[PDB]
Symmetry: C3
Subunit: 298 residues, 3 copies
């Protein structure tokens, strides 16, 4: 009974492999799977609006045969006028899955503890597991492989992207380096779980403040905006020079939106190493795959 | 020429049975009717926002083959920039029905005086007839025949729910009782029309401040979110004990647990609240079908 | 390769003829053409909300088999957070076209410059070309051939409807007149481009401050919302009578009855205002279809 996806480690490696395999299949034949045919409903809920998250979910649902019901931040926020449990119980009568952008993980857990349909974290304060799914797919297609690559993330190590890349990466078997200054380290319990999960996949977790050392011989370079007070992040800028220390075949990822000239330069964003646009496109195929997998299991 | 749904008594007892029988058919086979295949448009319009009305309507529309165009209260309110008549006449060209959540009844009548397609009260200040259709549907799946049951409503006796349970209940032949505190009674015209409808069906209308007497021998106990005068009207286990042993509890939602209802009642075995939310879809679906095929 | 629609003259006269003719076929058979079957996505984005635009576009898209993702003025404005070029490249990966209600023309040009799918001007500060297609469509069904007809616009000569009726009107072969007061002239370069386009189609452009004269003999009388020196330009029974006996009136909506146009004109027998509003749906499908097969 009933699977959810609130954080990257909610999947096991084999299960993450299956989902990513299915993402490959769906990119090629986007309307070949129709488990939401009817149309069946899926809730798409935003505590804070995210436009790229709405596009990719809303079209991806429609393409699986369903109808996304989308609700804004312009509505009464979910836990204010009734408990989240009540909202979950009611929504479970209307839709086959619940996709939710929100704040703390405790709110996701609350909803997921009583729902009779899958709950999916669209993007939270702590995690961004749908983005990492698309990151991994973009890596799979660009490099032909996943296990054993060396991935480096630069910038705020406490942000949602840094956590997810840690958890999602080691699940995929990727050696993850987080390159972050001073006091912008990963939340410790996230780091412990990523190390624990790494012991089953042959991966590892490295945290350092040395942006040169983290860039050296890396296969993938990743960065995010400096908060989604900026003096400490400048050595961590993805520029031509830093990318020149990476493997010669290395690729660059950015979940977007980018602030060109701060965390990433125009040469690197617009250059041959950048997978940024395919990555963006891949939000659509990954989340599609996620849903199918979840629905056939629930 | 054109049937609308603005209040529970726009349908006749005979016709309300048709909609209800159809709603049970639709619960069993949710995609078997496709009158909106095309897709044809339906307008879904919110002067004040309602999440659960959005879910149920929008989905039910899609499952009839059509497509709902949803506008929020994050857009210019309907009667300000142009007359309600003008908007009605334009919408009429784009959609086959108009589903509107709005305030005063006069706004609904203004829109429905000139529309060439059915107009539906999604929810308003004065009635909530789609909720009562869902209420009657779930009552019917638990206790069979509707004619003759005793239904009591507790809480603010002047809000849209009481008006509608009054209007809807007697339509279906149920004996409706509003239990309200001293300064909170139904609109007297709604009250009188309910008494006028009840004569056709064998029903009756009671208004009282006696929670204990209203709860006694009751078949169905209902409440809505409400305040010191309201507390003796609370749906609690001690109030439930006075009811019939087979009694059920409905609540239109959201609940404010610890006020109008209690955790033990709403999560207890007499609670029908979840089936009650679900049937918003089925009832509204069947309403669309019924109206479209008669327009 | 890749055709956009940001101003009316983005289409050549022959290209325009095609779209309009298609509009009539799609009016007669709304679900006959299905290029976005899948559904494929189209972006519908509003820097500024517009209810009637949402309706026509969203259902248009649904009836070609696609799915409209609609984003409101209630999200971050489209350029404040990432550059437009980046937005365009990303949307080009999700949708097959971008429909956009924005402000300055340079914002549309920016998006159009790097997107790999058609970009459409749903409404902007300078132009409203989608409305004029609907206007042209409605004039065609009333009077037959468009060539050589006289159309006069009344009110603010500098607004988006004024520009678009000039460029769109002369593109169809229509003698366009703007009746505007004082210092409410058309943009000089828009007027220039209208004059060139008119030499091509063998039509003409007139701009005057004499309403009486502009009304005289005209086939089509048009107006938009406005406030003091516009009062001699009102569409009243008087001004209508000075036109041709078989004239028609258009108004893009919403109308402030009593100001730019009176009750008796608007609810009269020369008023094509509701057909004009219906045809927003049909003309924008035709544009979608046309632009898509060329991209």
């Amino acid at each position: 009974v009933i699977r959810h996806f609130l954080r990257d480690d909610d999947l096991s490696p084999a299960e993450q492999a299956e989902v990513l395999e299915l993402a490959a299949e769906l990119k090629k034949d986007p309307v070949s799977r129709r488990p939401l045919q009817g149309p069946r409903g899926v809730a798409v809920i935003f505590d804070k609006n995210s436009t790229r998250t709405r596009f990719s979910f809303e079209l991806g649902i429609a393409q699986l045969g369903g109808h996304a019901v989308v609700v804004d931040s312009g509505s009464t926020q979910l836990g204010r006028d009734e408990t989240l449990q009540d909202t979950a119980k009611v929504l479970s009568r209307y839709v086959d899955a619940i996709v939710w952008r929100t704040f703390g993980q405790e709110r996701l857990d609350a909803m997921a503890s009583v729902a009779t349909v899958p709950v999916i974290n669209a993007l939270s304060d702590e995690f961004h597991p749908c983005q990492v799914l698309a990151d991994l797919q973009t890596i799979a297609e660009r490099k032909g492989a996943l296990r054993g690559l060396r991935l480096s993330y630069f910038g705020d190590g406490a942000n949602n992207m840094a956590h997810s890349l840690l958890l999602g990466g080691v699940t995929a078997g990727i050696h993850v380096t987080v390159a972050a200054p001073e006091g912008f380290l990963p939340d410790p319990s996230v780091r412990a779980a990523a190390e624990r999960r790494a012991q089953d996949t042959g991966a590892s977790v490295t945290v350092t403040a040395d942006a040169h050392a983290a860039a050296a011989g890396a296969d993938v370079l990743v960065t995010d905006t400096w908060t989604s007070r900026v003096k400490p992040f400048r050595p961590f800028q993805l520029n031509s020079r830093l990318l020149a220390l990476a493997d010669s075949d290395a690729i660059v990822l950015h979940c977007l939106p980018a602030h060109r000239g701060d965390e990433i330069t125009d040469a690197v964003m617009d250059g041959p190493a950048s997978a940024v646009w395919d990555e963006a496109e891949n939000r659509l195929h990954a989340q599609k795959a996620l849903l199918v997998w979840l629905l056939e299991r629930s």
